[PDB]
Amino acid sequence: DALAEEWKRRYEKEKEKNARLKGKVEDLEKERDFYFGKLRNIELICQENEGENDPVLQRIVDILY
Amino acid sequence: DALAEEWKRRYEKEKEKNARLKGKVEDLEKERDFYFGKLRNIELICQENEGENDPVLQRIVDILY
Ligand SMILES: [Zn+2]
């Protein structure tokens, strides 16, 4: 009766929260992978130019690691 | 009665899910900010060396943007 309706409202409220959290997880994952992909692209650029011995690139490697 | 107990179990289950999603959101946010901070650190390194005209740095700027 009223005790069931009360809990249902709590379930649905918690269920709406779940839906919003699932959407934030998906958005944060895309963002993390996006920035992560850039770091791997830049790491590669640096690895190709290990022969330049550029002290700037070395700074950038330190930040990557 | 039994109808309330059933919904309670659904609320608690959904509530456990919420707790796990909140922890994943916090973990993904830390990771995203971590990688993001590195890109801003590297962007700065590049901006300091705009006078070198290094074509490698230009590659790295393109990846940053
Ligand atoms: Zn040079």
Query: Can you spell out the DSSP letters for B7-43?
Result: HHHHHHHHHHHHHHHHHHHHHHHHHHHHHHHHHHHHH
Query: CA-to-CA distance for B44 and B40, rounded, in angstroms?
Result: 6
Contacts of A60 in chain B (CB under 8 A): 42, 45, 60
- Distance of CA A9 to CAs A13, A20, B13, B18, Å? 6, 17, 14, 16
Given resolution (angstroms): 2.2
CA distance A23 to A28: 9
* Structural domains counted in chain B: 1
Determine, for residues B42 and A63 on separate chains, whether the beta-carbon distance falls below 8 Å.
yes
One-character DSSP codes across A39-60: HHHHHHHHHHTTTT--HHHHHH
| Token pair for A24 | 């934030």
> Domain with A26 in it: what CATH number?
1.20.5.1430
- Report residue B48 as tokens: 């300091």
User: Measured between CB atoms, which of B28, B57, B59 is closest to A28?
Assistant: B28
Nearest C-alpha of chain B: how many angstroms from A26? Answer: 9
Residue ranges making up the domain that contains B57: 2-64
